[PDB]
């Protein structure tokens, strides 16, 4: 996935930040969650 910049004008858009994206077998063998803002998995508020 490629990102350029918010203010970039449509004329000259070039890659600025590459970002590899994948899936992993994420697990938490020795921890749990104490604050879960929203029920929906993978939401913005859930970042905290």
């Amino acid at each position: 996935e490629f990102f350029d910049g918010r203010d970039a004008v449509a004329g000259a858009l070039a890659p600025e930040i590459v970002l590899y994206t994948e899936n992993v077998n994420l697990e938490t063998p020795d921890s749990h969650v104490v604050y879960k803002p929203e029920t929906s998995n993978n939401s913005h508020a859930n970042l905290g």
């Binding site: 604050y35 803002p37 508020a45 905290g48």
Partner: protein, 42 residues
């Protein structure tokens, strides 16, 4: 004019001045981004 609005039932309930806003209670969100108009009190 009454003050901060806490609970709506409409006749919204306005914070009791004797104790509310309880100093202990505060918004618990750094990823809030609520937007619109963020009225706050203390």
């Amino acid at each position: 004019k009454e003050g901060l609005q806490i609970g709506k039932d409409e006749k919204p309930i306005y914070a009791d001045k004797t104790y509310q806003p309880e100093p202990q209670v505060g918004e618990e969100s750094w990823t809030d981004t609520d937007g619109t108009n963020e009225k706050f009190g203390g």
